[PDB]
Structure 1
Amino acid sequence: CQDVVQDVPNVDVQMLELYDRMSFKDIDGGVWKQGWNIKYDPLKYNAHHKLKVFVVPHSHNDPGWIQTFEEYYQHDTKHILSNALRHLHDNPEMKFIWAEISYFARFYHDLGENKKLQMKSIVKNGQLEFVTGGWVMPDEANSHWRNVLLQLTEGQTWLKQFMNVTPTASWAIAPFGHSPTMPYILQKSGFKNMLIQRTHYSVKKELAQQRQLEFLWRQIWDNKGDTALFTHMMPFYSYDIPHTCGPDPKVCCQFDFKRMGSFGLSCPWKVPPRTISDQNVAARSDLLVDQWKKKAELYRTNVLLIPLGDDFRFKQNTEWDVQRVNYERLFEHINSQAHFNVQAQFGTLQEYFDAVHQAERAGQAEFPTLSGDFFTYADRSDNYWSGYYTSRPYHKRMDRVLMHYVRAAEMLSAWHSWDGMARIEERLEQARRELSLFQHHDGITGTAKTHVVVDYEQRMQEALKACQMVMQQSVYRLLTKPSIYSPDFSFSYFTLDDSRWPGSGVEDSRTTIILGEDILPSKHVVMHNTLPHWREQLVDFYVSSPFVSVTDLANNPVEAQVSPVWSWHHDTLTKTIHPQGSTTKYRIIFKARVPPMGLATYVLTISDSKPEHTSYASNLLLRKNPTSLPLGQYPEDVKFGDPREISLRVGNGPTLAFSEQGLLKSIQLTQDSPHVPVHFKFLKYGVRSHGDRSGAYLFLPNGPASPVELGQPVVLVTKGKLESSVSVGLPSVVHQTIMRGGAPEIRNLVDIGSLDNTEIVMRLETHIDSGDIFYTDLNGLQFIKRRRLDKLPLQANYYPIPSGMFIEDANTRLTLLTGQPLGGSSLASGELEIMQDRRLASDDERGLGQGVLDNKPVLHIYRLVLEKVNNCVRPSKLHPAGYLTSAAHKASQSLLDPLDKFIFAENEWIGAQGQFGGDHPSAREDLDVSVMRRLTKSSAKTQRVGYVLHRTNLMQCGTPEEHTQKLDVCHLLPNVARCERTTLTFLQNLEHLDGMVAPEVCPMETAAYVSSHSS
């Protein structure tokens, strides 16, 4: 295994280093507004050394943005694809590339067989080429790597089945900045080349000057280079035709033949295209070849990529003709005039890359190595696209919830083969496709119109119901005596109970377990653990009595805590925000112990008085002017006091101190240790009243944030043996700190209400001497070092926080893990901050055509880990990566992949069993089974199950936490007959494994295995 900590890679371009050196001046470059006037030596090309030009027609099709997926399909995309089929069929030299398989699948299944055959033939002959082949062209900032892989797999599995092709070149012209997670996944999925576009204009200029726009993109920790993927960065401001022929858009626009008027389009530079004729083809060719040779100056080979397309292009037959016939006339002239020394043709993306690598192998170029990312994007001036790290945070959180239930549904159902009547594959396919769709760069990003957001939400809600169905059917099968099992595949044997989605205060969706002497004495509940190690975790349920005790299915008592059900109300009569307690339902909490990838059953039983093994939390309401809080049968009376500082400790865990406003002020890790200052604060950013306005994409604050005025908020303290909390009703946020004996959990119920032109930020203030350094993750996969740059504006120092962030000095680290992607930064030494929501009245001129005025309450979740790190083996000061500790990693897992909870729906479960998976290996803590997916339907004689295994890298800090069992996924199901290593999509076998054993993977590596079973 390569060491991902101690060896700093030697790369030609390291993006953090480049950032430190670059001046980012925004000067007028001339016709290339963000560049310079390019010059070329005309004698560079000659008869023995020609410029080879590939014009690559394309059409950018958003799977929802300003219209829904289905609306765009009906209005635009079905016509684009129908006319592509006809036009390519009839014009054999014409070419076209296609990226978004969601749309292509939607189209193809509506074709008659004759047209399906015609379509297969233009793909097989290379006229129509799929690029990337994902379901969508995903966002790269907010998306989790697991869902990037999911959508990639969804599209490529479709393409292999129906088109018999697997793309090896990726096309990502539209995400708002770019992540190294993409080449990581793509390189492990058979890819050889990728293309990107939306990078900071200053980066484009810098790399163009050095001819470093094509590079071997490796991971930041990769000393050897085995992760490298050849990458092409386009050089100009847009992917449209004016910005793809060359540096002068006034000239390039004249070669977009849809802009002569009858299509309703024109050239903003005020010179229209003219139809090519024999009288003008020489002059027109001179202009165009000059543009091409200038673009070629920015690259190292004599092979040039010229994209030819724009959003929802190639719709009308007349548009196909006007582009094709004019370009054909240009190519005939240019290629026959030896003095240009050019050979130009329509091509595909793979044709371009193949020709580049032929030039490379001929010794005509050597490419630089690069590591780093391409965040935060700015397309012009100070317009940094850090707003979309937060926009529409409800749906960002929903993404993470659905991510987990897709994993859990696929895993739980994979253990068996299912009859088709069970509709398992149907429901899983729907769930995967709806989550996959949402990875679009207008989905999870929060950059779509209101009604489109609603469509994505409705789709995801259906997907969650599909996962629930599959999960609960699977639990019933896994835990019922086989000779008793009698399934009705439409029935709900269990319902899922989720304490954090949509959340208390967002939706009252949880079911109470109703027990009573005259109705039902007890209830079975089941926990699932998707992670491949034993886990203990507190779980809670709502119950109709406080006098409830818990047993395991050996009837062993389990210690439990009962607490009230508190809900917060904005009392419009008193103009305060305060909690009310239920008088008929209560929360019971207990520790569930669940096998690796397994299930555990418990029983809740009512009694007529306090049970021996159940304790009751105390409750203290801090506010002036209190009024009573009755709690029905709950046996401890609420206590009241004036606001005051208070401290809490659960178990032998940290002691937390809180201000009189209910906000953390310090953490004491152990009995004698210092009370370390760690202060939460809520602040507000506003919007500029002159110049450019913040919107869904852009964050353009009117200076540093101002503190939220808190008034005298009401504080609720619950103190229990198993779980304690401090909750406070602040303006726009019910803020909660929860303690269970380790790192606290933070929950924010965020309701920005009608606060227009406001962004609410949560900041942590410490004494940690972090300087200008902080760490943020990329797609939940890796942590990258950030350096705050005072030469850039505030919004430029905001980065995606898809799963966590930290600051550290020599001795102390503070890590904030998130259950949802949000934007954040460290704007001063010792600080962390993360945006909660944003409400914006203006459009920000990027095409959305609305503000963000559709906010809804969202429950954001976090873990806060303060640690001593002086004994940890960390990377050197020059290394661009950072790594989590064990405790921080486990805290992230507790947010993203919690135990699932199931409540048996009927009164009696006949044949119930206590556990599943007790013989599953308990793997080392850094290893995960990211995906378990049965790949075959029940009719297949040889069943196949796919696994994706990911090993992270945790710091060595002198805490072994060892003896663990080897995990061989190929022996998790019986009767294995073959085990193969595959690409991450499962679509190509890479190694036949001896002994049918799937080895574990190296730190920071991800591998896929497929086991086959005879059984």
Structure 2
Amino acid sequence: CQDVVQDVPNVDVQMLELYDRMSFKDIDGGVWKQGWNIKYDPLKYNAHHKLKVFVVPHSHNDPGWIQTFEEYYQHDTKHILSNALRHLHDNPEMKFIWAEISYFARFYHDLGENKKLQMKSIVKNGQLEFVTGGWVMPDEANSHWRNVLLQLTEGQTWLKQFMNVTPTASWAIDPFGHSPTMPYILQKSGFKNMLIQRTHYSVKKELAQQRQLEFLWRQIWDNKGDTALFTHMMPFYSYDIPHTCGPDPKVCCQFDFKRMGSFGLSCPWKVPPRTISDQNVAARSDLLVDQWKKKAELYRTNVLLIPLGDDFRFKQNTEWDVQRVNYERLFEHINSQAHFNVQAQFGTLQEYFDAVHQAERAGQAEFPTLSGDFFTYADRSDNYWSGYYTSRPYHKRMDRVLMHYVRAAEMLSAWHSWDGMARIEERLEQARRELSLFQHHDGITGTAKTHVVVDYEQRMQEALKACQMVMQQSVYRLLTKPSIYSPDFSFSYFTLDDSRWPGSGVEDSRTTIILGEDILPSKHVVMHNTLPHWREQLVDFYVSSPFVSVTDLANNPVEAQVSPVWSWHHDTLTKTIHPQGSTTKYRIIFKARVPPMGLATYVLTISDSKPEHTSYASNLLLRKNPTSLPLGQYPEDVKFGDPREISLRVGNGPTLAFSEQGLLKSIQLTQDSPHVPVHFKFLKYGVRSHGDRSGAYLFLPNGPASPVELGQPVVLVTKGKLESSVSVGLPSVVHQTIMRGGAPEIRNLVDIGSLDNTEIVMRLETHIDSGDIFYTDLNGLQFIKRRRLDKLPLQANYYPIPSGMFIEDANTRLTLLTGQPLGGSSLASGELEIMQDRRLASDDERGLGQGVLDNKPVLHIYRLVLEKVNNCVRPSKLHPAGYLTSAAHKASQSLLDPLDKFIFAENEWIGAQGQFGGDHPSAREDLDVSVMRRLTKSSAKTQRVGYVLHRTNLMQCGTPEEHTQKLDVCHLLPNVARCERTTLTFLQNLEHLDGMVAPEVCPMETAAYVSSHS
């Protein structure tokens, strides 16, 4: 295995190093506003060395933005695809590329057979070409790699089944900045080339001057270069026609033939296109070839890519004709005028890349190597697109909940083959497609109109219900004696209980387990662990009595803690935010221990008085002017006091000290150790009163954040043997620190209410000497080193925090793991900060046409890990990556893939069993089975199950960390007949494996395997 820590890769362009050297000056470059006046030598191209130009028609189709998916499909996309089929069928030389398979599948399934056959023929013969082939063209900042792979696989599996093609070239013209997680996944999915567009204008200028816009993009830790994927970065401000022919938009706009008037479009540079005729073709070709030769100066081969398209283009027949006929007149003239030394034609994206690599193999060009990312994007001036790292945070959090539910549903149901009447494949396909749709660059980004956001939310809610159905049917099958199992596939045997979604204070969605001497003495509950190692985690359930005890199914007592159910209220009468306790619902908490990829059953039983193995939390309300808080049968009375500093310790774990306002002020790791200053603070950013306004995309603060005025907030302290917590009602946020014996969990119930033009940030202040360095993750896959640059404005130093961030010095590290993608930064040495929500009254002029005024309460979750790192083997100072410790990685897993909880729905479960998966191997902690998916329906003689295996890389810090078992996914199901390593989408077999054994993968690698069973 390659060492991903100790060897700094030698690359021609390393983005962090480039960033440190670049000046980022925004100078007026002339007609190329963010470049320079390009010059070329007319003698470069001659009879024996022509410029080959590929004009590639395209249509950018968003699966929701200003309209919903279905609205756009009915108003625009179905007409574009119908007319593309007719026009390409009738004009053999015309070409077209298509990226969004969610729309193509929605169209193709509605076509009659004659037209399906016509469509298959224009794909087979190369006229219509699929680029990327994902369900969507995903956001690259907030998306988790697991969901980027899910949506790629959904679209490519559809393409292989119905079109018999698998794209090897990717097209990403609109995501707002670009992540190296894309070439990572694409190169492991058979790709050979990719194209990107939205990178900082200063980066385009810098790379264009060096002819480094085409490069072999490798991962930041890849010393050898095996992850490299050829990448083409487009050079200009947009993918529209004015910005794709060459450097001067006033000229290029005249070659967008849809802008002459009858289509309601025009050129803002005030020179319109004119129909090509024999009298003007020479002058028009002179202008166009000059633009092309200038664009060609920025690249190394004699093959030039000229995209021809824009949003929802090629809709009308008349548009297809106006673009095609005018370009064909230009080609016939240009290609016959020897003096131009150009051969131009319509082409596809793969045709362009194939010709570029032909030139490379002929020794005509060599390409530079590059590592790093392309965040944070700015399209002009100081307009950095860091706002969408936080916009619509409720749905960003929902994405991560559904991510996990889809993984758990596919894994739980994969163990068996199901009859078609069970509708398992139907519900899983629905769930995968709704989560895949939301990866769109106007979905998870929070950049769609309000009614479109509602549509995505509705689709994800249906997907969660589908996952629940499949999971609970699977648990019933896996834990019931087979000769007793009697499924009704529409019945609810179990209901899921989720303590953090939508979350306390967001929705009352959780069911209370109702026990009583005159109704039901006990209830079975089951936990599922999707991770491939044995795992313990505290779990909680609501119960109708505080006198409840827990047992396992061998009837062994399990230690439990009962706490009250506390709900916070913004009291419009007293004008305080304070908690109310239930006098009939209680929380019971206990430690569940679950096998790798397995299930464990427990029983909750009521008694008439305090059970021997259940303890009760104390509760202390700190506030001026308290009033009583009765809790019914709960056996400890609530205590009261004036606000004061407090300290708590659970188990052996850290001791946390809190200010009188209920906010952390220090962490002491052990009895002997220093109380390390770690302070939480909430602040607010505002908006500029003149000039550009913040909106869904842009973060344009009116200076550094100001502290939220806290008043004298009400603080609630709950102290228990298994779990303790401090919660405080602050303006717009109920902030909660929970202790269970290890790193604390932080929960914020964020309700920005009616605070217009405000962004609420949570900051951590420490004395760690981090300087200008901090680390953030990319897509939950890798941590990249960031350097705060004071030559850039505050908003440019914000980066996506899809799953975690950290700061460190020689001795100490503070890592904040997140359960949802949000924006964040380290704006000063020793600080970390992460945005919670933002409410903006103005539109930011990128086309959305609204501010963000649709906020709703959201429960954000985190883990906060303070550690000594002086003993850890870390990368050298020049390495661009960082790596988590074991405790931080486990804390991230606790947020993203918690245990699932099921409550048996009827009175008695006949045939119940105690555990499933006790014989599953418990794999080393850095290995995960990211995906387990049965790939065949029950009628297939040979069953196939696919697995995606990912190994992260954890720092070595001196812990022996020892005995685990090798995980061979091909032997997890019986009767294995074959084991193959495949691409990550499962669509191509790459290696037949000896002994039907699937080897584990190397650190930072991901592999896929398919086992076949007879």
- With the length of structure 2 as denominator, give the TM-score of the two structures: 1.00
Instruction: Tell me the residue number matched to 2:693.
Output: 693
CA distance in 1, matches of 2:961, 2:871: 16
Q: CA deviation at 1:582?
A: 0.2
Give matches, 1:501-900, under 5 Å.
501-900=501-900
CA distance in structure 1 between the aligned counterparts of 2:363 and 2:148, rounded to whole angstroms: 36
Deviations 1:665-700 (A, max 9, x none): 000000010000000000000000010000000000
Distance 2:492 2:115 in 1: 42
Note the C-alpha offset of 1:557.
0.1
- The 3-state SS of whatever aligns with 1:93 is coil
Query: Whole-Å Cα distance in 2 between the matches of residues 692 and 572 of structure 1?
Result: 36
Residues 386-407 of structure 1 deviation map (CA, whole Å, 9 limit, x = unaligned) = 0000000000000000000000
Deviation string 1:515-554 (CA, Å, 9 cap, x unpaired) is 0000000000000000000000000000000000000000
Residue 466 of structure 2 aligns to a residue whose secondary structure is helix
- Give distance in 1, aligned partners of 2:123 and 2:354: 18
- 1:272 to partner: Cα distance: 0.2
Alpha-carbon distance in 2 for matches of 1:230, 1:652: 51
2:82 alignment partner, SS class: helix
Deviation at 1:514, TM superposition (A): 0.1
Give the Å deviation of 1:473.
Answer: 0.1
CA distance in 1, matches of 2:385, 2:570: 34
The CA distance in 1 between the partners of 2:251 and 2:583, in whole Å, is 74
Q: Which residue is 1:964 aligned to? A: 964
Partners of 1:369 and 1:341 in 2: CA distance: 31
User: After superposition, what is the alpha-carbon deviation per residue over 1:454-498, rounded to whole angstroms, capped at 9, x for unaligned?
Assistant: 000000000000000000000000000000000000000000000
Q: Which residue of 1 aligns with 2:995?
A: 995
Using the alignment, how far apart are the partners of 2:624 and 2:134 within structure 1?
Answer: 58
**Deviations along 1:11-41, whole A, 9 cap, x unmatched?**
0000000000000000000000000000000
Please state how far the C-alpha of 1:961 moved relative to its aligned partner: 1.2
Give the Cα separation in 2 of the matches to 1:451 and 1:600: 42
- 2:629 counterpart SS class: coil
Q: How does 1:370-385 map to 2 (within 5 A)?
A: 370-385=370-385
2:117, 2:902 → 1: CA distance? Answer: 47
Shift of 1:732: 0.1
Q: Distance in 2 between matches of 1:996 and 1:316?
A: 54
Secondary structure of the corresponding residue to residue 437 of structure 1 = helix
Q: How many residues align?
A: 1014
Supply the distance in 2 between the matched residues of 1:927 and 1:569 (Cα, whole angstroms).
43
CA distance in 1, matches of 2:957, 2:331: 64
The superposition leaves residues 24-77 of structure 1 with CA deviations (integer Å, 9 ceiling, x where unpaired) of 000000000000000000000000000000000000000000000000000000
Q: Deviations over 1:789-846 (max 9, x none)?
A: 0000000000000000000000000000000000000000000000000000000000
How far apart are residue 115 of structure 1 and its match? 0.2
* Secondary structure, counterpart of 2:727 in structure 1: strand
Alpha-carbon distance in structure 2 between the residues aligned to 1:40 and 1:652:
71
- Secondary structure of the 2:219 match is coil
User: Could you tell me which residue of structure 1 aligns to residue 485 of structure 2?
Assistant: 485
How far residue 781 of structure 1 moved from its aligned partner, in angstroms, is 0.1
Separation in 1 of the partners of 2:933 and 2:992? 19
Following the alignment from structure 2 to structure 1, what is the Cα–Cα distance between the partners of residues 593 and 746?
23
Distance 2:556 2:943 in 1: 39
Give per-residue Cα distances to partners, 1:406-426, cap 9 Å, x unaligned: 000000000000000000000
Provide Cα deviations, 1:165-216, integer angstroms capped at 9, x if missing partner: 0000000000000000000000000000000000000000000000000000
Alignment partners' CA distance in 1, 2:940 and 2:618: 58
Deviation at 1:647, TM superposition (A): 0.1
Write out per-residue CA displacement over residues 632-669 of structure 1, whole angstroms, 9 at most, x where no aligned residue. 10000000000000000000000000000000000000
Output the CA distance in 1 between the equivalents of 2:417 and 2:846: 48
Measure, in 2, the Cα distance between the counterparts of 1:250 and 1:674.
Answer: 65
**C-alpha deviation, 1:848, in angstroms:** 0.2
Matched, 1:176 2:173: no
What's the offset of the Cα at 1:755?
A: 0.0
- 1-side partners of 2:961 and 2:552: how far apart? 27
- What's the secondary structure of 2:698's corresponding residue? coil
1:17 alignment partner in structure 2 = 17
Q: Map Cα deviations across residues 719-750 of structure 1 (whole Å, 9 max, x no partner).
A: 00000000000000000000000000000000
CA distance in 1, matches of 2:546, 2:806: 40
Matched residue SS, 2:932: strand
CA distance in 1, matches of 2:984, 2:336: 46
Q: Secondary structure at the match of 1:610?
A: coil
Q: CA deviation at 1:1006?
A: 0.1
Q: 2:962 & 2:286 partners in 1: Cα distance?
A: 70
- Tell me the distance in 2 between the aligned counterparts of 1:107 and 1:847: 26
Give CA deviations for 1:584-606 in whole Å, capped at 9, x if unaligned. Answer: 00000000000000000000000
Aligned counterparts of 2:82 and 2:1008: Cα–Cα separation in 1: 37
SS of the residue aligned with 1:764?
strand
Q: Which runs of 4+ in 1 moved over 3 A?
A: none
2: distance between equivalents of 1:598 and 1:871?
35
CA distance in structure 2 between the aligned counterparts of 1:748 and 1:109, rounded to whole angstroms: 44
Q: Distance in 2 between matches of 1:698 and 1:60?
A: 22
Matched, 1:931 2:898: no
Q: Secondary structure at the match of 1:452?
A: helix
Q: Alpha-carbon deviation of 1:751?
A: 0.0
Once the two structures are superposed, what CA deviation does each residue of 1:422-464 show, in whole Å capped at 9, x if it has no partner? 0000000000000000000000000000000000000000000
Deviation, structure 1 residue 962: 1.1
Q: Deviations over 1:313-360 (max 9, x none)?
A: 000000000000000000000000000000000000000000000000
Cα RMSD of the aligned pairs, angstroms, is 0.2
TM-score under structure 1 length normalisation:
1.00
Q: Distance in 1 between matches of 2:902 and 2:581?
A: 25
Q: Unaligned stretches of 5+ in structure 2?
A: none
State the SS of the aligned residue for 1:119: helix
Q: Give the unaligned 5+ runs of structure 1.
A: none
Post-superposition Cα deviations, 1:695-722, rounded to whole Å, max 9, x if no partner, equal 0000000000000000000000000000
Aligned runs of 1:357-396 on 2, under 5 Å?
357-396=357-396
Q: Deviations over 1:860-906 (max 9, x none)?
A: 00000000000000000000000000000000000000000000000
Residues of 1 paired with 2:466 and 2:47: CA distance? Answer: 63
Q: Is the partner of 1:322 in helix, strand or coil? A: helix
Q: Distance in 2 between matches of 1:445 and 1:198?
A: 15
Percent identity for Structure 1 against Structure 2: 100
Query: Could you tell me which residue of structure 1 aligns to residue 413 of structure 2?
Result: 413
Alpha-carbon deviation of 1:238? 0.1
Shift of 1:583: 0.5
Q: Deviations along 1:294-325, whole A, 9 cap, x unmatched?
A: 00000000000000000000000000000000
Secondary structure in 2 aligned to 1:378? coil
Q: Distance in 1 between matches of 2:600 and 2:679?
A: 39
Q: Which whole-Å CA distance do the structure 2 matches of 1:604 and 1:546 have between them? A: 11
Q: State the SS of the aligned residue for 2:331.
A: helix
* Inter-partner Cα distance in structure 1 for 2:584 and 2:722: 22
In the TM superposition, what whole-angstrom CA distance separates every residue of 1:195-253 from its partner, at most 9, and x where no partner exists? 00000000000000000000000000000000000000000000000000000000000
1:526 aligned counterpart, secondary structure = strand
Aligned partner of residue 440 in structure 2, secondary structure:
coil
Distance 1:223 1:932 in 2: 30
Alpha-carbon distance in structure 1 between the residues aligned to 2:994 and 2:573: 73
- Tell me, yes or no, if structure 1 residue 227 matches structure 2 residue 217: no
Q: Shift of residue 960 of structure 1?
A: 2.2
